[PDB]
Every structure is written in structure tokens, then in C-alpha cells.
Swiss-Prot record, chain A:
Example GO BP: subtelomeric heterochromatin formation
Signal peptide (residue range): none
Name of the protein this chain belongs to: Minichromosome maintenance protein 5
PANTHER family, A to Z: DNA REPLICATION LICENSING FACTOR MCM FAMILY MEMBER, DNA REPLICATION LICENSING FACTOR MCM5
Gene name, Swiss-Prot/TrEMBL: MCM5
Originating organism: Saccharomyces cerevisiae (strain ATCC 204508 / S288c) (Baker's yeast)
UniProtKB/Swiss-Prot annotation, chain B:
Subcellular location: Cytoplasm; Nucleus
Domain of life: Eukaryota
Subunit structure and binding partners: Component of the MCM2-7 complex. The complex forms a toroidal hexameric ring with the proposed subunit order MCM2-MCM6-MCM4-MCM7-MCM3-MCM5; loaded onto DNA, forms a head-head double hexamer. Interacts with CSM1 and MCM10.
Family: Belongs to the MCM family.
Additional observations: Present with 166 molecules/cell in log phase SD medium.
Function: Acts as a component of the MCM2-7 complex (MCM complex) which is the putative replicative helicase essential for 'once per cell cycle' DNA replication initiation and elongation in eukaryotic cells. Core component of CDC45-MCM-GINS (CMG) helicase, the molecular machine that unwinds template DNA during replication, and around which the replisome is built.
Name the record gives this protein: DNA replication licensing factor MCM7
From Swiss-Prot, chain C:
Part of the whole protein covered: 13 to 738 of 971
Protein name: DNA replication licensing factor MCM3
Biological processes annotated in GO: DNA replication initiation; DNA strand elongation involved in DNA replication; double-strand break repair via break-induced replication; mitotic DNA replication initiation; pre-replicative complex assembly involved in nuclear cell cycle DNA replication; premeiotic DNA replication; silent mating-type cassette heterochromatin formation; subtelomeric heterochromatin formation
Keyword flag Electron transport: no
Binding site for ATP: G352, D353, P354, S355, T356, A357, K358, S359
Length: 632, 241, 601
């Protein structure tokens, strides 16, 4: 006791020039009715040393004395305010955030228990609000005797239960939920760093608990730095003998290693001097993979990132794009995926459909305990701000496929489910290796048309076709360090290119050649050049630096290369002037006509038809409904 | 126990009323035999299955009994207010006087007053909208007007179930509700009770009380429908005659 | 006799005597209620030969009258409330005693501490009297709920009583006592139950989101349900915007009861629960901004500049840009006297090959849009629909969970992959769009609800890029009154020109390396102030145009309807709003003409 008076003087006497902060901050939080206060514990060790260590030693005791020392002034301020000029005051909640000593999540001693600990991770599933009656008034039914139970700190023990005694017995005691004050158990579960460094193992994760002003502040997937209390709950053996599952009481939380040795920067800058740097780089990636050079470099410009522009309005251009490895096996793509997965600083290889238990996308899973919700996580939620590796991309569930196509453009996924509307960000960049269908004929077939009925997927996809442990560090280095920017001369060069492109290409499309040119394609080229200038690390682009990109993308175009009046003349004239009921005229009769006109391909047939239902020939709607599986 | 499930006195007094019932009943005037007597024998001749009650002749019975006192207790205001009891109790009042509920054989219906009788001056019938219907009218006798939808195929519904101990003899009368029931077994026979061996009972269909209900849902006349919203619907109970 | 009167209760009631005697205003008000009932009672009896019992109470009085009763009810509604309602029922009995119920109170206020919104709520606010505002969904479908029990006992005659205290009964909770259904009295005499003696009350419970408007930048919404019964039941539709006075209940055991996480289902009771009006931002224009508007309003060329302000990123489509603007504005709204309302707002539609940014733009729309929801293809369920949330949630009152359009009423609905969406929906859309309202009979709550939201939609060319040369129809691919219904239909083309392309790529590159903030500001004030009304100045021009339109166009193209005309109307009125003109002008007409032409050609 009366150390509280030291906390009252700490709230008051402690002053940084020119202004004592906590007095003001409190005065507002009450004015805001925040019933909350934020402490930097380091600042306390600054003002009062002994109290600080006193705290870090055994906070379980002290924290409440803080809270009282606060509410004691809070009453004074409260009255001085309410009276000039215009109870019931609860014990405030203080959020203490220290940036000082991180702990590796993989590394926690049993000596940290019931002591203040700061460490960080990625929140997988932010669990799920509950009601904590921390003050609860009780009544004996027969005895009519009344009581109140107040539980200050708890795991999820469950900590406390009702008494058994008021004949009157068994437990007569009856909860009056009138007089009880309930708090929110978030029960977030903190997962460690996924990219590093179990690397052989499923990474370990921790259970957290968040009350009152600490609830709901974070969407899971948000990297955060927790100040919390290492603690343990017995729970129920899933264990033994005597093992107690630890857990972290979290107070408070500071939401969001980039630091490296000088020598790393040095050797970096040395490599930066390399003229063959891009070339030798292109040599580093695919030691085993023979060739696939366009692909080889493509990975490179991919990892380098690209232009990210938040420039007003909130419209934020993104980087960097997408990669399509699709093709027949023997291309090594599946392995290469593993490879980049290695090289990429933060990478998640998920081929699916998602796998196995992991939702391919950020998913909402109720913490079954505490109920309410927690982010179930997904590939993207975890891979955000990094690489995302997808295979069998054609095999993916439609449900997530949408969210893909959406987030891919927006980098943001929005989850409206139930009481949670949050929109979450995936800065992840996706590279996809599809398996094309039926083989070389798909190239003989229109280069597109392979994806669902919708090449739209392809429209979204931009590119369609050293120890490397250091290169990781370098990749990080260049990535964080420099934001390149573009040269006007190159810019106009590009204008000429694309004009020749859409121009010559439309001139090619005058014949309705089945195949494209997107402004998106242009921007892709852009982000490519930015990627290479960031490979050069230069804040500024070079026109030649672009000239490369132009040709490379021209190869991707080559990959892209490999009659509506006629087909609709056929189909429409058929329907219209042949069998209006359509009866007798179905898949047989078209099979005859087109068979006898030698223009039928089943894909072409169903393509013109799906076009007709899809152009809403509602007669084609109608015929589909009937004549189709009516058959003829 | 007292102080649990309290009693509360109300202006309602059934004792005198039931008497009043017996008085108006078949001892009636306006309609040589009094209407209820003769009608009652026509039923007693076995010819007439259901009995339609009318409150207007009750209104007349009261103006007879008002004037021409002594002042007699008001049944109408009590009937429409409860009327549920009034059914069964009225039934008993009748069952005595003829030219238990198990052997009745007759159905009792009532006809509300609008009317010129309202104009007497004397509510029970105000034809109403389902909108106009408030959940506070529950238990009230009400008259309404609306569009018949649904209007169902009568099916026999059983009231009470008769099993016979055949050891203890007697009978087992199980009333039944809602959709389903579980048939009783052993014997509840007071003689089969406390015996070392209870009789076994099996139902007899000839004995039990069954009824053909007939179902309907009714919709707002839709002219009555408020400007907005949509016309409401309502279920209705009908059985026997 | 119960637990016998407590001078706690006694003094609480007694203390609440002088009030309401002072202020006596209520003293006669109740009498008014009684009077009304009496008169209606005479109408039923004599002619063929009703009102609720709650009376509002302004909390302003207490502070002056009783600061401690003020503070007490606010804090301890549990204690203060019931004795007060008692006092009320008593005085009520006093007013007219002779002829032969809760007699509740609204508790007006004068709020509050205790003024908080559904986002910021509990744990201290737990079990205090609260006022929260927000939208109405998921609503509820009322169920009648029963009260007090009555039983006849033969041969003993007599009668019984029983009562039932809901978890929702009172507000602040209580040690619950299950009473089940009284029967078979002890001594073993059976109890014949009686209705019409046994009282009942209708029941309803609805959910309340935090005010969409006031919602934060972006996040998950946090809503709370409240129970409403009898009188309180049914007053408002899902999608209504309202502020509710009711206590915060913790009700229910939170799992400590059954020994074998989440806890303590909590809810708001009633109570006052006022429906409130809101437009169809926030914002703060101070002095300076409003001035800035004012000066700028004079600028003759301002409109084009505006039309430009939208597309930092987008070349061209200034026609379109202008269009969007007009969408934001929207030709006021007209509800004729005792007759249907003229739709003010306009529905827009765009058609072209992808990369048209059509997707992209829509975002930009959503941005400064001031609400509203965006929808993409399918999409659904129900879109704007309440789904008639089954079952109940809570109490037996089956919820109506207000959907997009209802929620988007007053607001901008973005329809993406509009072609993709199911005709099943489209049928409804016909109603929503034109009829301007939604109607729900489903099971169920039979009501028609109003979603006034404006509409834009983007949908792919029927198949491939073929839109360009394709016939004006069948390029369409979504007949028909659909086509009619969108006030605006825009065909964009991706066809290439090298000169044009250069022009693009310049802008493009530059991008990689009239302030919109002021925009929405300029918008809101314009919105609330002021309506241009209309002027015969233009009327001629318009008719001239329209006749020219049906006339020459039906040869040229189609469809031209009265719809076309109305669209013109809304168009002009908006343009005046852009002009800020309190009147319509013939110039604005020339504009709407130009645009409509562009639409046609």
C-alpha cells in the first residue's frame, strides 16, 4: 500500500517538458469516457526506478494497485470536471505498452511466469468475445441471503464458481444478473512468426486473453507486439503428470526483423556494383531447373516488388502483379514453387482448394470457447505482404475463387460474416501454376478459353507463359530500402510501344481472330520496370532498363498468342428460322448441321451456345432448360 | 399452499350465474313450449345433434329479468369476457334437464349479437380486421370478417382415450392433445394401484371420444389492409357440427 | 402479501409523489388517456347500438426536482423504476377510480451519460439506463406472449393466481424462479385453468446496429438486440434509423450454472424507443468551406471542373463523370399529395469490354459516395432483403434482417457483374428500382419496406468484346425493363487508336510517380440545401427534345418511353442542384439534353 500514492504522484508529478502527459491524457480519456489509460512502462522506469522493477518482478499483485491509484485521482478529476461547469465511476483499465525487450516466441522460460514479458507474433485467430461478470452479486434462494463475488484476474480456468451453502442446500445461491458487471473475453490466440524459423516444424502459438478496452482492437492476421503476463492454466489434460498449459494474459498490446548488420549492407552495395548482377542473379535461381529463362528472370522481377502508390485518392496502385506457370509437366514448375517458397523471405505454398486444414483464404472460425469469433486464417491472411504460391489453381473452390479475383486486384479481402464486417488486407502477390487441359490442342484451341468458361482469371494474371540465403537478405534489403521511380523518356517510349500494341493488335483483330491488350497489361509492364529498377535498387528508372521489360513482356505476349457474326449467324439463324419451339432441333440437330457443316467442335458448339444463354437469348435460356437434356 | 399460487377475488361469481342459466334455460318466454325446452326434446328425440346458442334472447331474458326484477347478474358481459368456461358450465347446466361429458351426444354453439339488439341499446360482434386484432383480445368472444383461404378437410380428432384394465375392470380415460400421444399401459385403476400386480389395459375404440375438426386460415379483406404493409392471415378452430 | 412493503419501496414511491404532482403536467395527461379510453368505450356500446397506459417522463425534471432520484434511476433503474411505476399506477387509480395494468413510462430525457451508441457499450454501462441509436435490423416477427395464470378449483370453487417473470421482465435481472404451469392444486383438487382472466402480452425483439452513417472508416459492425412487447411491438421497420431508451440486461447464467468461455446473454429492454428521421457525411463545413462553395457556385464553368475532379486516374468519360455527379445529386424527390411519389433518383448502367476500369471506377464511386453498399454479381442472399430472420432472435419474435438496399436506402448501390446476377433477384429489382420500395409477405411479417437507394451497375458485354459492332440489342443481353429501368445506359468501347494510346500511356506513367476532400463536403450541403423546384423556362425545351426523341429515335434506335421524359426531369433538377439554383434553368436543360444525346449517341 501507499506505493499507490507514488503512482498518484507519478500520474501528477511526472512531467516531460513542457507538459505532464498522463494528467492531460487522462483528462481526455475521461472526457472521452475511455475509462482507459496508456502507459509506457519504460517512461516509469525513467521517472521511478524501484517501482518499475517492483512491477516487472510480480505484476499480478501490483497492477490492481495501479488501477486504484488511478481511479483515486480519476474521481477528483471527475468531480472537478462535472461541477465546473455543468460516480458511478468504475476502476479504470490501464494499457501499458513497452517497446523495450522482445522475446522470441520460440523462446520462453518457465522463469517468465507471472512476470512482465514482451514478444511479438502474427495473430492467427482473434477469439471470441465473452461476458465476464468480474463483479457479480449473488443470493441464496431459500436463505434469501445475498452475496457478491468479484473475480479480478482469471485465465478461462474456469477461475471461480458459486458457493454450495446458503439446507438451504445444495447450492442455493442465485445469480442476480441485475447487479453484475460483465467484461469481454476476446481470448485471442497468438501465432509466432510463420516464415521463421521452425522451418522444419509446425510453428508454436500462444493463447491470449483480452478484457474490456483491450478487446476487438485487432483483426487477426495483424502483426502485433504484445506486452503480457506469462501465466499458466491447468485446463484439462489433452499431458500429465501435472502439466499446466501456459497462457499469456496480455496487457497492454502494441500493434504494428528489418534491422541488419552493417556488413550485410556493405556486401550488398558491393553486389550492387555488379554489372552482371541481374545476370548472375538469373543464374542463381534455377540451378537445378534447366532453362525456362523467361520464367527464371520472371521470378526475379517478381520478388523485387514494384510500384506501390497510395497517391490520393485512397486508390492505391499495387505491386507486384501475378505469374502463370501453366503448361504440361516436365516444366519443373511444381518444384520451382518449393524453391521460391524457400527464397522468398515470407512465403506460403498452398496448392488447392487450400490444404489441408488451412483455408485457402482468410476464414472466420469461432473460437468455440469464449464463442464469438477468430480469424481461422488462410493462405493470404498468413502470406500477406509476401509471396503466395498456388498450384492446381484451376482446381480451386469457386467460393474462394471469387475472393481471390477480388482481393487480387484490391489486395484487400472483406469479410462481412455475422457480427464481423472487417475488410482485411492481403499484400501478398500471387504466382500461379495451372495445369492446362487436353494438352497441345489447347494451344491449337484458342490460347484462352482454358480457364473455367472464363479466361477472366487470365485477364487478372499479369504474366502468362549467390547462396540465396544471402539473396534472401538482399531481397529483403532492396525491398525495404528503396522505392524506385520512373524516367519520362522511358515513359514516352512505353506510350509508343502500347500504341503500336493495341494498334497493330486490333489490326490483327479485324478478322475476329480468336485469342488481350489491357491497360492492365501496360501497368504490368510498369511494375516490371519498377521491379528491375529496384533490382538496380535505383530510385530512378532507365529507358534501357525498360527496353528489356518491353521485350520480356513481348515474350509473355507470344505466350498469349498460342467470328461472332458467323457463329451467331449460325446459331441465331438456326433457332430463329428453323425450330421456334426448338423441339426436335436440339443437340442432335445442331450436331447434324454443324457435323454436316464441318464447323462443329464440342467446345465451339457449347461455346456459341453458352454465349446464347449468356447473351440472354432467353429463348436460349428456355431451350437450355428443355431441349438440352431433352437432347434433340 | 397460500402465499403460493395466490387467490384473487374478482367481481365474477359463477355460483349464482349457473343458477341464472338454469333459469333462462328451457324456462324461457318469448319463444306453448319454451324454445329451449322444445328444442331440447327435439334433440332428446335424438333428431338434433348441435345446439346453437344466441345471446340476443339472453338480452331479452335479462330485460325480462331486469324490469321485472330482481336485478339479475349480467351473463353477456361475463360470457364474452370468458365464455370458455361458459361453454362447459352451460353444458352441465343443460345436461341435467332433458326430456357426463363422456355421454353428451350434443354439440353446443353460440351466436353473437350485433345488432339491432346492440341498438336496444345494449360489441361481442364487431367484425374486425386481423390487423385490428390485438393479442389482448385473447379469450374474448369476437366476430370478424375476412377472406377464406385454406379451409380444411375434416379429420377425426380424439378428445379422450379409453383403456380398460379387464383385471381391475374399470376404465382408463386419457385426454389427448396436439398432434401425438403415447398410449398408457399397466393399469392406473385405483384397484390395480397398490396391488402387487396391476392390471393390463387395452383401449377400446368404441368407447373413446373422437371429433372431426375442420381447419381454416383467413386473410385480411385487403380493403381493410392499411395503406402499407400487407394483408395478414389467421388460423381458426372448428370441430363437430 | 409477498415479502411485505419496504420503506425502501415505500419511500421510493412516496418520494415520487410530489413529482409527478410537480410537475403536475402528467397528472392531467393520464386523465387524458383515461378519457380517450372512456370515449372509445362509449363508441363501441352506444354507436353500434384503446390507448396504451405508458406516459412519457422528461428526465429534465428530476435533476431539478430530485438529483438523487435522477442519478438513482439512471444508475439504478432497477430500484427506482418499479416503485415509480407503482406510484403511477396508483395515481392513475386515483384519477378515475369508480369504473372497472402496468401504466408504464417512456422516460423521455435529457440524456445522457448513458447517451452511448452500440459500438461503445457495457461493461460499466451494464445494468444502467441507456440510450443508443442506430439502424433497425434484424428486426423480428412478433409473437404474442402469455401472462399471470388463473385456475378454477372445484368443488372448492375459489380460484388461483400465478405470475411469470421473463428474463426480459424488469430490466436489471433477478434470481429466476421457474413457475411452469399451475395445475392439480394441493390439496389434490385439480385446477381448471381459465383464460381471458389470465393476462397476456405480445412479444418482439429486434437487433440494432451502430449507426451506419456514424460508422467508423471501416471495420466490423457491432449490433445489439432489444426486446419489445405489446405496445412497444412493431412500431418500426428493419432499416429504420432510431434511438432506443432501454436498460442493459445481463440476463441468463453464463455457464457457471452447469458444471461440466462465453457468458451472460445481455439485452436491452424496451423502452421508450423513438423512431427518428435521417436524410433519405457527416460533416463540418465551418464558415470557410460553406463560403468556398458559395463563391465557387458563381463560377460558370465550375461543373466541368467538377466533372473532371473525379477521374484523377481515368482519361475520358467526362460524360460519364458528369453522369456520376448527377447520380450523387438526383433530381430531388416528389411525393404527390395523397398519391404516389415521383422518383427523383437515377439508375445508371455501363457496358463495355473489360479493363474499362468499370470495376475500378465503381470503387472510386464507393469512396466519396457517402455510403452505400456495393454488390457484385452474385452476390445476394436477398441483397436488399430482410431474409425474415428465422427463427425469432429473440423471444419468439421472428427477426427481419434488413438487407443491402434497405440498408442502402438513401444511398448508392454498386452492382458489379450485374449481368452475372440471377434473374430471380432481377424480378425484385424491378420493384425496388421503379416502385422505389420493397414488399415482404414472406411467411411472415407482412409489410412493404422502403429502400430509396440510387442504382448503378456494370456488366460485361454479352459475350467477349463483341459489344462494339454488335446490334444495339442483343449486345444488351439482359432484357428488358431492366434496360428501361436504369436511367442511364453507357456503352464504353476498348477499340484502339495509336494517338489515343500515346495519350493514355503518358498519363499512365506519370501516375506511377478541386481537392477530392472538398468534394463530398461540397456534396452534402448541396444535398440538404436547396431544392431547385422547377421552371417553365425549360419545359418547352424538354418537350421539344422528347418529341424529337421518340420521333426520330424510334427510327434511329430504341426504347423511348415516358421513362425517358422523367429521366430528363430528374436530370434537369439535379443540374440545377449542381448549379445550386433554387430554380430550374433552360441551360441545365441543354446539358441534360447533351448527355442524353450522348447516351443515345
Amino acid at each position: 500500500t501507499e506505493i499507490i500514492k507514488s503512482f498518484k504522484n507519478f500520474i501528477l508529478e511526472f512531467r516531460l517538458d513542457s507538459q505532464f502527459i498522463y494528467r492531460d491524457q487522462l483528462r481526455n480519456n475521461i472526457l472521452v469516457k475511455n475509462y482507459s489509460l496508456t502507459v509506457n512502462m519504460e517512461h516509469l522506469i525513467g521517472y521511478n526506478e524501484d517501482i518499475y522493477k517492483k512491477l516487472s518482478d510480480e505484476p499480478s499483485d501490483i497492477i490492481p494497485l495501479f488501477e486504484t491509484a488511478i481511479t483515486q485521482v480519476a474521481k477528483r478529476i471527475s468531480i472537478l470536471s462535472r461541477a465546473q461547469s455543468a460516480n458511478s465511476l468504475p476502476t479504470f483499465q490501464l494499457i501499458l505498452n513497452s517497446n523495450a525487450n522482445q522475446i522470441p516466441l520460440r523462446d520462453l522460460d518457465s522463469e517468465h511466469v507471472s512476470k512482465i514479458v514482451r514478444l511479438s507474433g502474427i495473430i492467427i485467430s482473434t477469439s471470441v468475445l465473452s461476458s465476464r461478470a468480474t463483479y457479480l452479486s449473488i443470493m441464496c434462494r431459500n436463505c434469501r441471503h445475498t452475496t457478491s463475488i468479484t473475480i479480478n484476474n482469471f485465465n478461462t480456468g474456469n477461475t471461480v464458481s458459486l458457493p454450495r451453502s446458503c439446507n438451504c442446500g445444495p447450492d442455493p445461491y442465485i445469480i442476480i444478473h441485475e447487479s453484475s458487471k460483465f467484461i469481454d473475453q476476446q481470448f485471442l490466440k497468438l501465432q509466432e512468426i510463420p516464415e521463421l524459423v521452425p522451418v522444419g516444424e509446425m510453428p508454436r502459438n500462444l493463447t491470449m486473453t483480452c478484457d474490456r478496452y483491450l478487446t476487438n482492437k485487432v483483426i487477426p492476421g495483424t502483426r502485433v507486439t504484445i506486452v503480457g503476463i506469462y501465466s499458466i492454466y491447468n485446463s484439462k489434460n489433452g499431458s500429465g503428470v501435472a502439466i499446466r498449459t501456459p497462457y499469456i494474459k496480455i496487457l497492454g498490446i502494441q500493434s504494428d526483423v528489418t534491422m541488419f548488420t552493417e556488413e550485410e549492407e556493405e556486401e550488398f552495395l558491393q553486389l550492387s556494383r555488379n554489372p552482371k548482377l541481374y545476370e548472375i542473379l538469373t543464374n542463381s535461381i534455377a540451378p537445378s531447373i534447366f532453362g525456362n529463362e523467361d520464367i527464371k528472370k520472371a521470378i526475379v522481377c517478381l520478388l523485387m516488388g514494384g510500384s506501390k502508390k497510395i497517391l490520393p485518392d485512397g486508390m492505391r496502385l499495387r505491386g507486384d502483379i501475378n505469374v502463370l506457370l501453366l503448361g504440361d509437366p516436365g516444366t519443373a514448375k511444381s518444384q520451382l514453387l518449393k524453391f521460391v517458397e524457400k527464397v522468398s523471405p515470407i512465403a506460403v505454398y498452398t496448392s488447392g482448394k487450400g490444404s489441408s486444414a488451412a483455408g485457402l483464404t482468410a476464414s472466420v472460425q469461432r473460437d468455440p470457447m469464449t464463442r464469438e469469433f477468430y480469424l481461422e486464417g488462410g493462405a493470404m491472411v498468413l502470406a500477406d505482404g509476401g509471396v503466395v504460391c498456388i498450384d492446381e489453381f484451376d482446381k480451386m473452390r469457386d467460393e474462394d475463387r471469387v475472393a481471390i479475383h477480388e482481393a487480387m486486384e484490391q489486395q484487400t479481402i472483406s469479410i462481412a460474416k455475422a457480427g464481423i464486417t472487417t475488410v482485411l488486407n492481403s499484400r501478398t502477390s500471387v504466382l500461379a501454376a495451372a495445369n492446362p487441359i487436353y494438352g497441345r490442342y489447347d494451344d491449337l484451341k484458342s490460347p484462352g478459353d482454358n480457364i473455367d468458361f472464363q479466361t477472366t482469371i487470365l485477364s487478372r494474371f499479369d504474366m502468362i507463359f549467390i547462396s540465396i540465403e544471402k539473396m534472401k537478405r538482399y531481397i529483403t534489403y532492396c525491398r525495404l530500402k528503396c522505392a524506385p521511380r520512373l524516367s519520362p523518356q522511358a515513359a514516352e517510349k512505353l506510350s509508343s510501344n502500347f500504341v503500336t500494341i493495341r494498334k497493330q493488335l486490333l489490326i490483327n483483330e479485324l478478322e475476329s481472330t480468336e485469342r488481350p491488350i489491357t491497360i492492365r497489361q501496360l501497368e504490368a509492364i510498369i511494375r516490371i520496370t519498377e521491379s528491375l529498377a529496384k533490382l538496380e535498387l535505383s530510385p530512378i528508372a532507365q529507358e534501357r532498363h525498360v527496353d528489356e521489360a518491353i521485350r520480356l513482356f513481348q515474350a509473355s505476349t507470344m505466350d498469349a498468342a498460342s467470328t461472332s457474326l458467323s457463329e451467331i449467324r449460325r446459331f441465331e439463324q438456326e433457332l430463329k428460322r428453323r425450330l421456334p419451339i426448338g423441339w426436335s432441333t436440339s443437340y442432335q440437330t445442331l450436331r447434324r448441321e454443324f457435323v454436316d457443316t464441318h464447323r462443329f467442335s464440342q467446345l465451339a458448339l457449347d461455346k456459341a451456345l453458352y454465349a446464347l444463354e449468356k447473351h440472354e437469348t432467353i429463348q436460349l435460356r428456355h431451350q437450355g432448360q428443355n431441349i438440352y437434356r431433352s437432347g434433340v | 399452499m397460500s402465499a403460493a399460487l395466490p387467490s384473487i377475488q374478482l367481481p365474477v361469481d359463477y355460483n349464482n350465474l349457473f343458477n341464472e342459466i338454469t333459469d333462462f334455460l328451457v324456462t324461457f318466454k318469448q319463444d306453448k313450449g319454451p324454445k329451449y325446452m322444445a328444442m331440447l326434446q327435439k334433440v332428446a328425440n335424438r333428431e338434433l345433434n348441435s345446439v346453437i346458442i344466441d345471446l340476443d334472447d339472453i338480452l331479452q331474458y335479462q330485460n325480462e329479468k331486469f324490469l321485472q326484477g330482481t336485478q339479475a347478474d349480467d351473463l353477456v358481459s361475463a360470457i364474452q369476457q370468458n365464455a370458455n368456461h361458459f361453454t362447459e358450465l352451460f353444458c352441465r347446466a343443460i345436461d341435467n334437464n332433458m326430456p357426463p361429458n363422456l355421454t353428451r351426444r350434443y354439440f353446443l354453439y353460440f351466436k353473437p349479437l350485433s345488432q339491432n339488439c346492440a341498438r336496444r341499446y345494449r360489441i361481442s360482434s364487431k367484425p374486425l380486421s386481423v390487423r385490428q386484432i390485438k393479442g389482448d383480445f385473447l379469450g374474448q368472444l369476437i366476430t370478424v370478417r375476412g377472406i377464406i383461404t385454406r379451409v380444411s378437410d375434416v379429420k377425426p380428432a380424439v378428445e379422450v382415450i379409453a383403456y380398460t384394465c379387464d383385471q381391475c375392470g374399470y376404465e382408463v380415460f386419457q385426454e389427448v392433445n396436439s398432434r401425438t400421444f403415447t398410449p398408457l399401459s399397466e393399469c392406473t385403476s385405483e384397484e390395480c394401484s397398490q396391488n402387487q400386480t396391476k392390471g393390463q389395459l387395452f383401449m377400446s375404440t368404441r368407447a373413446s371420444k373422437f371429433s372431426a375438426f375442420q381447419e381454416c386460415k383467413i386473410q385480411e379483406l385487403s380493403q381493410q389492409v392499411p395503406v402499407g404493409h400487407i394483408p395478414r392471415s389467421l388460423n381458426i378452430h372448428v370441430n363437430g357440427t | 402479501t409477498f415479502f411485505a412493503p419496504d420503506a425502501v419501496f415505500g419511500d421510493r414511491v412516496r418520494r415520487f409523489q410530489e413529482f409527478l404532482d410537480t410537475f403536475t403536467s402528467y397528472r392531467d395527461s393520464v386523465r387524458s388517456i383515461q378519457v380517450y379510453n372512456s370515449n372509445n368505450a362509449a363508441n363501441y356500446n352506444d354507436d353500434q347500438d384503446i390507448l396504451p397506459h405508458r406516459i412519457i417522463i422528461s428526465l429534465d425534471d428530476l435533476r431539478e426536482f430530485d438529483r438523487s432520484f435522477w442519478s438513482g434511476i439512471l444508475v439504478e433503474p432497477a430500484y427506482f423504476i418499479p416503485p415509480a411505476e407503482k406510484a403511477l399506477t396508483d395515481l392513475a387509480d386515483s384519477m378515475d377510480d369508480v369504473p372497472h395494468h402496468p401504466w408504464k413510462l417512456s422516460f423521455k430525457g435529457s440524456f445522457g451519460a448513458h447517451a452511448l451508441s452500440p459500438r461503445t457499450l457495457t461493461a460499466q454501462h451494464l445494468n444502467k439506463l441507456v440510450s443508443v441509436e442506430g439502424i433497425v435490423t434484424k428486426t423480428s416477427l412478433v409473437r404474442p406472449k402469455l401472462i399471470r395464470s388463473v385456475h378454477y378449483a372445484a368443488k372448492t370453487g375459489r380460484f388461483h393466481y400465478r405470475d411469470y417473470t421473463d428474463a426480459t421482465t424488469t430490466l436489471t435481472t433477478r434470481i429466476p424462479t421457474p413457475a411452469i404451469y399451475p395445475t392439480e392444486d394441493t390439496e389434490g383438487n385439480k385446477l381448471t385453468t381459465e383464460y381471458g382472466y389470465s393476462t397476456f402480452i405480445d412479444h418482439q425483439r429486434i437487433t440494432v446496429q451502430e449507426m451506419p452513417e456514424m460508422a467508423p472508416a471501416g471495420q466490423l459492425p457491432r449490433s445489439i438486440d432489444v426486446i419489445l412487447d405489446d405496445d412497444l411491438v412493431d412500431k418500426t421497420k428493419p432499416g429504420d434509423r432510431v434511438n432506443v431508451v432501454g436498460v442493459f440486461k445481463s440476463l441468463g447464467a453464463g455457464g457457471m450454472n452447469q458444471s461440466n468461455l462465453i457468458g451472460f446473454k445481455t439485452l436491452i429492454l424496451g423502452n421508450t424507443v423513438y423512431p427518428l428521421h435521417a436524410r433519405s457525411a457527416r460533416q463540418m463545413l465551418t464558415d470557410f468551406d460553406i463560403r468556398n462553395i458559395n463563391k465557387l457556385s458563381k463560377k460558370k464553368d465550375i461543373f466541368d471542373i467538377l466533372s473532371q475532379s473525379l477521374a484523377p486516374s481515368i482519361y475520358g468519360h467526362d460524360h460519364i463523370k458528369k453522369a456520376i455527379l448527377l447520380m450523387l445529386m438526383g433530381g430531388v424527390e416528389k411525393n404527390l399529395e395523397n398519391g404516389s411519389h415521383l422518383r427523383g433518383d437515377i439508375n445508371i448502367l455501363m457496358v463495355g469490354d473489360p479493363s474499362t476500369a468499370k470495376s475500378q471506377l465503381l470503387r472510386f464511386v464507393l469512396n466519396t459516395a457517402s455510403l452505400a453498399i456495393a454488390t457484385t454479381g452474385r452476390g445476394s442472399s436477398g441483397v436488399g432483403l430482410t431474409a425474415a430472420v428465422t427463427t425469432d432472435r429473440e423471444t419468439g419474435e421472428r427477426r427481419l434482417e434488413a438487407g443491402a438496399m434497405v440498408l442502402a436506402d438513401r444511398g448508392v448501390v454498386c452492382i458489379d457483374e450485374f449481368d452475372k446476377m440471377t434473374d430471380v433477384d432481377r424480378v425484385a429489382i424491378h420493384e425496388v428500382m421503379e416502385q422505389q420500395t420493397v414488399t415482404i409477405a414472406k411467411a411472415g411479417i407482412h409489410t412493404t419496406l422502403n429502400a430509396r437507394c440510387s442504382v448503378i451497375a456494370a456488366a460485361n458485354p454479352v459475350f467477349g468484346q463483341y459489344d462494339v459492332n454488335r446490334d444495339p440489342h442483343q449486345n444488351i443481353a439482359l432484357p428488358d425493363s431492366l434496360l428501361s429501368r436504369f436511367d442511364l445506359l453507357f456503352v464504353v468501347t476498348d477499340d484502339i487508336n495509336e494517338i489515343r494510346d500515346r495519350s493514355i500511356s503518358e498519363h499512365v506513367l506519370r501516375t506511377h510517380r478541386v481537392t477530392i476532400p472538398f468534394l463530398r463536403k461540397y456534396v452534402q450541403y448541396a444535398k440538404e440545401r436547396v431544392i431547385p423546384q422547377l421552371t417553365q423556362e425549360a419545359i418547352n425545351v424538354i418537350v421539344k427534345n422528347y418529341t424529337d426523341l421518340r420521333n426520330d429515335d424510334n427510327t434511329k434506335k430504341s426504347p423511348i418511353t415516358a421513362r425517358t421524359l422523367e429521366t430528363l426531369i430528374r436530370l434537369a433538377t439535379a443540374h440545377a442542384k449542381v448549379r445550386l439554383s433554387k430554380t430550374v434553368n433552360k441551360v441545365d436543360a441543354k446539358v441534360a439534353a447533351n448527355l442524353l444525346r450522348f447516351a443515345l449517341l
